[PDB]
Design a protein around this ligand. Structure first.
Ligand code: FAD
Ligand code: FAD
Ligand code: HEM
Ligand code: HEM
Ligand code: HEM
Ligand code: HEM
Ligand code: LMT
Ligand code: LMT
Ligand code: DMW
Ligand code: DMW
Ligand code: SF4
Ligand code: F3S
Ligand code: FES
Ligand code: NA
Lengths: 254, 655, 239, 254, 55
């Protein structure tokens, strides 16, 4: 604690008798981190779905992230950092957005009642945002620690192994619907909150962004469900007890 | 006992009340504003025509000044107004606009260029010069030759009221809503405040002040059909009348609007007719030309309303489950013209009439709109009861006479608020009051007793049936056309209705938040108010301004160049006491003559008018020749007063 | 007959110890161009003169009759029964406002508080002279200030706002809109830093969760959505 | 939404004009769930530390949970349920305790300042409770999903494999300090909050519980650090690429 | 000018003032108690000897 922080705490204002700018900075970062995770997921959905184009592609993608074009077979440790970075952002975003959850019986009760009474779309969607986000506290943390600590086990074989033999599909199945509804709605809201694309006909702009939002969700869900099945089937075809599937892909180019 | 003290007490949170509150607060007087509802919901917010003020900015405003405005007002009043007050008005109106402008009121501005304009004497185009650009605009409204109605798009009253309310908040005025003044505190002929009922808690509280101002609006809801808000029931007027000292002026002077939506009464701005709107009967027949070949549906409002009633009487009216009405056809103006110029009229008809004004016809019928009558005051705004002032529609400052000018009422609210505000402020600061607890206690215990008696009455009468019967009587007998026989019938019935109103019984027994109990004490007040209008309408055997006596078609300048003064000195009497204040022609800047609209030579000429007229022609010519400005000439014809603060002249474009 | 409408009304007198929250039903026969204003008055004068409600202009201008009509905050006087294919209309007092009784809440005093909080009045150093030509303003600017100044403090955007329902110190949509109304007014001399000292906190603009319910229920169709966003961008750039 | 919930939302009271009892129930469950996780961890710390007594013990413990004494080699699926149950409680407790976090700039600022100013023990400890609890949102979720979905990989060998070869030790290391400080302080507070052991000299009772609290923490930390090293060393000695350590223990009695 | 009215004005929030305030309020008289400090901090609070009364 610093004098300024003592003075601000006790006076309600900064030493210059002005309101803190922290709320502004905090608001900014919440959107920034939300925006980063948002875009990240769009991309992530594609690069992970490459397995619909054959193991050679998937494997090709996997290798490039490990900076294939700079090291021997590529150092998986690259993915460890890539993951640690996303995890941190993930933590930070949750920490900031968390401030927005209803937080006691009264708030929860009155808001839930209101939502059901209102039957208002954008209000209902925020509830979804709150829920899915809360759910990811558990679902997201799991996935992020593995990718970070087992980067050398990514591949058409290995990934399919974890998906099925390690029972990740149930988690993955749920996280898929969660992060996509969360992210796309969060992106839509992010746009109308800051009005980047308002223009002269905000009403028309918003109307478009809503259709856009839904479309993006449907697409990513279908794509994600297809990619899902892909990983599932392959895993279910790994019957040989003499083959080490978990590290099979790694055992090709070190 | 609960007592609240302030230097300046204001009853009413509309334009007149709030502006007056600003005038007293700004000079260190602690002031309270009492209101039935949140102040920015007052009926003033409903105004959409505009505010009349001689700025002379726009092309059609060019040449305008105090004199022109003053004349429209006096001839418009049919000579029933105090011309000196009218002068005080027209002179200050310009500075009211500018002050409101300085306060943020988003007045529509003028922009260089030509524009599509309807003059219906030539639906030609108008050009606004470059030096006019950015100044406050004006529109054709009120039938004045000179276009001087200022406006803030289609929500003039709204924005105006908000600015004044906000100034009140800025100055720290005490705004206390859901509070109703039900009686005035007075002793030895001086007003010391008011006994107030908290509509929420039911507490009876005494509000004492060195000066009390009533700016309670009009008494339009004593009619069944009216444009007025449901809170314009004249109780402000009533509590003044119930002191037995203060007097009401020209209560029979009620004004009607010809095109309110039927039967709701929701207003359909005068711009409908002005832009081309067509009035049709049951057969779809455009009838105005039948009666007014020249002006047609562009005749003065006064005329149109009469014609519409005549036509209906001739049996050409539409039959509806709520009564007979006529049709307003604006569709012929085109769809593009409505959705841009009358986009607000299109919403009214859809939301409330369930119709598209561009495809269907709107049911219309003349209805009560403005109340020229009110608490009688001197030019300063003070009543016969010392320390009690009045401003706005609740008063009879009298600048309206028997016909207020369209655009002059919201104008008067703010203007009177400024001028009476000054005089009121001066009174409060200078006067010294002797407040006796014995008296406060009498009035407070008095009203507590009354409330209790209401709640305990075993009477079998129904307050609503009594109230509704009253509004029917008024509509059927004290409307646009009046004749002695029917007025006597109305007066007799209103008086009977009053007596039964005292045998009312109410189901709900609580003292707090009781709408039934509110009606219980209000209706009796509304009835005493209606009696003044009805009985005053019966005794005035002549036809002047809005007062049309079929059995007395001519305006009598010999026996009726006066003002009706109503009082109720004896609480036991059942009919108002009327007296007359004669209008002295020798003090008129303009002698009684023709008003401009309607029949001609329809007035018993007064010989002193003619004599005075010369005196005018003489004095005018001598000074006019001797090289003298319109100012010096005015001063010579009729000198008037004005608080120092508003004595300055009004700079205009082209000075 | 016009068809029987079932009118469910919330009733509760917090000032009475024996009163408890409950609903009451009335059977009204629909009529042409019938509004909720008409209905409530019918009920008052003939079925139950106990029911409390606030009506004034009955013309959608004053913003007095805001209430929940089938879950949506809206103006009673401007609502037509005809628009309910069920004949079942449920009325609740506006949430997020101190309840007086039944359908009557205190919106007026909350608004006056909101007005003071944002200092809702023109801030200028020099007082113009009211006897001289008014200062010139571009007609377009006047039109814009008017658009936002059209707010009739009905309270519907406050009651529609889930955020405000949960966090009562939230200044609300109407409050945010009021700021922009003065921000874009040439007559007002306040700067962005000035407005930051008013709504630059978690109870202010950053408290908004962009639920947008306000924008979708506003009976005057004020450009709330874009205007709130406009203000957020500007306030997040102070310093 | 039910009428009663509408009435409660809008009136602030129940239909009988009484305040909701939900706050009471909510308070109760927060403590109950907290108490369960608390006790669970005490036990968990022992049964997991059995490896300090040899693989035969550890393996013996592992097998009994899979209901060894009822099935062949014991059905690991038992542990899946045991874990799912704890996870749910874990979720529920976090959801309820979450209500108690500071939740905006002002709260966080003023409380942090206050804490530093006060230099008051029990106040500072609550901050720790808040922190550690927030940290476990991520740390705890990971561990719980594995035990639940890979119950057949528990054992002196297998567990040691994950600990080292799968890089869980870093997570485990942190979670160890977190859950123990959280749990023991939570238990201490749980006792003084409800005053189960107050008696005639609450001041003396509280003083004891504080010493008890610290002792329990030290013990479990040392024990946990020892058990930690145990798993670590064994994992670091699993060098044979031909041995399948992950499923080695399972491959003994099916 | 600021004016506050009450039927019974009490200057002092100690034992004598507060008790007198009870006597006037209990019988419907609106009463105000003025004090330099919060009333329960009056010097009366310092008494530790006791109150004399012939029970
Ligand atoms: C009805 C109407 C009038 C109108 C108009 C449109 C409509 C629908 N358009 C106009 C226009 O375009 N140009 C114009 O010049 N005038 C127009 N008018 C008439 C004009 O609006 C009125 O004359 C003017 O607004 C009157 O102002 P005033 O300040 O006098 O009154 P108010 O706004 O009605 O407010 C009265 C206040 O008094 C309070 N009150 C009333 N009785 C009591 C009691 N007993 N106790 C306590 N308070 C009381 C009301 O609550 C209110 O605030
Ligand atoms: C000092 C003392 C007195 C005392 C005692 C121990 C001490 C340390 N022990 C006593 C005991 O055991 N038995 C006993 O009988 N008496 C004892 N005393 C004396 C006793 O406490 C006093 O006589 C008694 O308390 C006096 O009561 P009183 O109600 O009169 O007054 P108060 O408590 O001092 O409160 C005075 C109030 O007046 C307000 N005040 C004062 N001046 C102003 C002005 N100008 N304006 C507005 N308010 C004012 C004070 O704020 C206070 O509340
Ligand atoms: C990769 C996963 C995640 C993605 C894709 C992501 C993305 C987003 C986006 C785009 C927003 C908009 C933020 C803004 O309006 O400024 C948002 C809002 C939100 N997120 Fe996340 N999020 C993620 C994880 C989480 C987690 C773990 C939590 C848990 C606390 C969470 C809680 C929230 C909440 C409650 C909001 C609403 C905040 C508000 O309305 O102000 N999010 N998120
Ligand atoms: C640097 C960070 C990340 C990396 C390296 C990564 C990597 C991967 C990979 C390779 C898979 C394939 C299956 C497997 O290998 O087990 C996958 C699947 C998945 N990831 Fe991520 N991921 C990251 C972050 C995220 C985040 C933050 C979320 C959202 C909380 C997420 C949600 C998912 C989901 C739902 C799938 C399932 C795809 C489907 O079945 O359609 N990932 N991820
Ligand atoms: C196995 C892990 C956990 C254990 C051993 C556990 C145990 C406890 C205990 C004993 C309490 C006392 C509760 C009471 O006073 O009623 C407590 C308090 C608390 N826990 Fe946990 N907890 C666990 C996980 C979590 C998680 C995941 C969160 C995250 C939201 C959390 C957040 C809290 C908070 C903030 C408190 C303080 C609540 C208050 O002061 O009212 N806990 N916990
Ligand atoms: C039914 C639930 C649980 C089961 C089946 C379980 C099982 C185990 C097992 C067998 C290990 C040994 C290493 C390994 O196999 O990977 C372990 C270690 C550990 N567990 Fe759990 N656990 C459960 C719940 C929890 C919870 C709720 C926490 C606290 C959030 C927790 C914290 C830890 C920690 C920190 C260690 C490290 C021990 C040390 O190194 O001293 N466990 N657990
Ligand atoms: C949408 C995600 C919410 C974010 C998490 C933080 C905010 C919500 C939790 C803080 C307040 C505690 O929330 C409290 O939870 C209990 C759940 O047993 C709810 O209980 C109510 O809803 C649940 C779920 O539909 C029903 O099974 C239960 O019968 C009902 O009484 C309380 O009405 C709520 O007020
Ligand atoms: C103890 C766990 C807290 C539970 C999580 C929920 C409550 C806390 C978050 C909600 C409020 C947001 O909290 C906000 O975070 C930022 C962190 O960048 C803090 O920022 C402040 O502390 C951090 C950490 O010491 C410093 O690096 C930073 O320079 C300083 O300005 C704000 O003062 C705080 O108010
Ligand atoms: C974001 C990302 C990263 C960082 C990977 O290492 C990776 C590896 C294999 C398939 C998809 C991915 C992927 O989508
Ligand atoms: C709680 C628990 C459960 C449920 C186990 O299955 C287990 C298995 C092996 C060592 C410790 C444990 C253990 O502590
Ligand atoms: S902004 Fe719209 S909804 Fe909100 S108070 Fe104003 S008019 Fe009503
Ligand atoms: S609904 Fe509330 S959250 Fe903001 S967008 Fe409107 S004020
Ligand atoms: S009564 Fe005025 S808006 Fe409804
Ligand atoms: Na009048």
């Amino acid at each position: 604690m610093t004098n300024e922080s003592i003075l601000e705490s006790y006076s309600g204002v900064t030493p210059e008798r002005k309101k803190s700018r922290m709320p502004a900075k905090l608001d900014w970062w919440q959107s920034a981190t939300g925006l980063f995770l948002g875009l990240f997921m769009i991309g992530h959905m594609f690069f992970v779905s490459t397995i619909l184009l054959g193991d050679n592609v998937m494997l090709w993608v996997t290798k490039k992230f490990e900076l294939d074009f700079i090291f021997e077979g590529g150092k998986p440790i690259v993915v460890s950092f890539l993951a640690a970075f996303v995890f941190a952002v993930f933590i930070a975003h949750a920490f900031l957005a968390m401030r927005k959850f209803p937080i006691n019986y009264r708030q929860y009760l009155t808001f839930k009642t209101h939502k059901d009474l209102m039957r208002h779309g954008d209000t209902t969607l925020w509830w979804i945002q709150a829920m899915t986000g809360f759910a990811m506290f558990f679902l997201g943390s799991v996935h992020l620690y593995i990718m970070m600590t087992q980067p050398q086990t990514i591949g058409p074989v290995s990934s399919s192994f974890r998906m099925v033999s390690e029972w990740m599909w149930p988690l993955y199945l749920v996280l898929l619907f969660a992060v996509i509804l969360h992210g796309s709605v969060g992106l839509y809201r992010l746009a109308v909150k800051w009005g980047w694309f308002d223009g002269e006909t905000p009403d028309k702009t918003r109307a478009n962004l809503k259709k856009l939002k839904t479309l993006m969700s449907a697409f990513l869900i279908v794509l994600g469900l297809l990619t899902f099945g892909a990983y599932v089937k392959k895993g279910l075809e790994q019957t040989d007890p003499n083959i080490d599937y978990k590290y099979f892909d790694y055992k090709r180019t070190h | 006992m609960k007592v609240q003290y302030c230097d300046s007490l204001v009853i009413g949170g509309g334009l007149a009340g709030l502006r007056a509150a600003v005038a007293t607060q700004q000079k260190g007087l602690s002031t309270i504003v009492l209101s039935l509802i949140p102040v920015k919901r007052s009926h003033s917010a409903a105004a959409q025509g505009g505010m009349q003020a001689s700025l002379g900015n726009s092309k059609m405003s060019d040449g305008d000044n105090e004199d022109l405005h003053f004349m429209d007002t006096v001839k418009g009043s049919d000579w029933g107004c105090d011309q000196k007050v009218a002068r005080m008005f027209v002179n200050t109106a310009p500075k009211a606009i500018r002050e409101l402008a300085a306060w943020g009121v988003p007045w529509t501005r003028i922009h260089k260029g030509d524009r599509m304009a309807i003059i219906n004497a030539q639906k030609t185009t108008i050009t606004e010069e470059d030096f006019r650009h950015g100044l406050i605009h004006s529109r054709d409204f009120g039938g004045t030759k000179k276009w001087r109605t200022c406006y803030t798009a289609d929500a003039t009253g709204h924005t105006m009221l908000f600015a004044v309310a906000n100034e009140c908040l800025k100055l720290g005025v005490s705004i206390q809503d859901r509070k109703e003044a039900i009686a005035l505190i007075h002793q030895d002929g001086k007003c010391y405040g008011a006994v107030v009922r908290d509509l929420v808690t039911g507490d009876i509280i005494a509000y004492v002040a060195k000066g009390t101002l009533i700016a309670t609006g009009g008494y339009g809801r004593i009619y069944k059909n009216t444009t007025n808000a449901v809170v314009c029931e004249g109780t402000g007027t009533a509590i003044a009348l119930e002191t037995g000292i203060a007097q009401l002026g020209n209560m029979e002077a009620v004004q009607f609007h010809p095109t309110p939506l039927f039967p709701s009464g929701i207003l359909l701005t005068e711009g409908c007719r002005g832009d081309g709107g067509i009035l049709r009967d049951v057969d779809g027949h455009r009838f105005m030309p039948d009666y007014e070949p020249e002006k047609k549906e562009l005749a003065s409002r006064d005329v149109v309303s009469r014609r519409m009633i005549e036509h209906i009487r001739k049996g050409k009216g539409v039959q509806s489950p709520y009564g007979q009405h006529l049709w307003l056809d604006i569709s012929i103006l085109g769809r593009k013209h409505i959705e841009t110029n009358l986009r607000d009229v299109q919403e009214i008809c859809e939301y409330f009439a369930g119709i598209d004004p561009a495809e269907k016809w709107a049911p219309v019928l003349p209805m009560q709109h403005y109340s020229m009558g009110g608490i009688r005051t001197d030019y300063r705004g003070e009543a016969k009861l010392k320390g009690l002032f009045s401003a706005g529609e609740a008063a009879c400052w009298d600048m309206h006479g028997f016909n207020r000018l369209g655009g002059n009422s919201v104008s008067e609210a703010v203007v009177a608020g400024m001028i009476v505000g000054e005089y009121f402020a001066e009174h409060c600061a200078n006067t010294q009051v002797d407040l006796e607890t014995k008296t406060l206690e009498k009035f407070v215990k008095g009203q507590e007793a009354y409330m209790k008696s209401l709640v305990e009455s075993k009477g079998t009468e129904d307050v609503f049936k009594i109230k509704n019967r009253m509004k029917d009587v008024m509509d059927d007998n004290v409307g646009i056309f009046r004749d002695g026989p029917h007025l006597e019938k109305a007066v007799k019935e209103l008086e009977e209705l009053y007596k039964k109103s005292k045998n009312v019984g109410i189901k709900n027994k609580r003292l707090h938040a009781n709408p039934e109990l509110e009606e219980a004490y209000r209706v009796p007040m509304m009835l005493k108010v209606a009696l003044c209008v009805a009985k005053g309408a019966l005794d005035r055997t002549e036809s002047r301004g809005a007062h049309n006596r079929e059995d007395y078609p001519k305006r009598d300048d010999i026996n009726w160049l006066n003002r009706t003064l109503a009082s109720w000195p004896n609480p036991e009497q059942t009919l108002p006491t009327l007296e007359y204040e004669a209008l002295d022609v020798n003090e008129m800047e303009i002698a009684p003559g023709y008003r401009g609209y309607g029949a001609k030579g329809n007035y018993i000429e007064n010989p002193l008018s003619v004599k005075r007229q010369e005196e005018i022609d003489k004095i005018q010519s001598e000074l006019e020749a001797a090289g003298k400005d319109r100012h010096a000439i005015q001063e010579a014809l009729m000198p008037y007063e004005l608080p120092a603060k508003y004595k300055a002249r009004n700079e205009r474009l082209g000075d | 007959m016009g068809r029987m409408l079932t009118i469910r009304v919330f009733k509760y007198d917090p000032q009475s110890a024996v009163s408890k929250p409950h609903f009451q039903e009335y059977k009204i026969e629909e009529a042409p161009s019938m509004t909720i204003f008409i209905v409530l008055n019918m009920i008052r004068e003939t079925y139950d003169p106990d029911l409390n409600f606030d009506f004034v202009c009955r013309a959608g201008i004053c913003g007095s009759c805001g209430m929940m009509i089938n879950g949506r905050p809206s103006l009673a006087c401007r609502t037509l029964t005809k628009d309910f294919e069920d004949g079942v209309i449920t009325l609740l007092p506006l949430p997020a406002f101190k309840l007086i009784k039944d359908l009557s809440v205190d919106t007026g005093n909350w608004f006056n508080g909101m007005s003071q909080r944002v200092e809702s009045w023109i801030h200028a150093q020099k007082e113009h002279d009211i006897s001289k030509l008014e200062e010139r303003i571009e007609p377009e600017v006047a039109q814009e200030v008017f658009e936002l100044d059209r707010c009739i403090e009905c309270g519907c955007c406050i009651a529609a706002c889930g955020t405000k329902i949960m966090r009562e110190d939230f200044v609300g949509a109407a409050g945010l809109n009021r700021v922009v109304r003065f921000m874009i007014d040439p007559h007002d001399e306040r700067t962005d830093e000035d407005y930051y000292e008013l709504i630059g906190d978690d109870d202010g603009v950053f408290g908004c969760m962009t639920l947008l319910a306000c924008h979708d229920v506003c009976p005057k169709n004020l450009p709330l959505q874009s205007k709130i966003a406009y203000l957020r961008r500007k306030m997040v750039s102070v310093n």
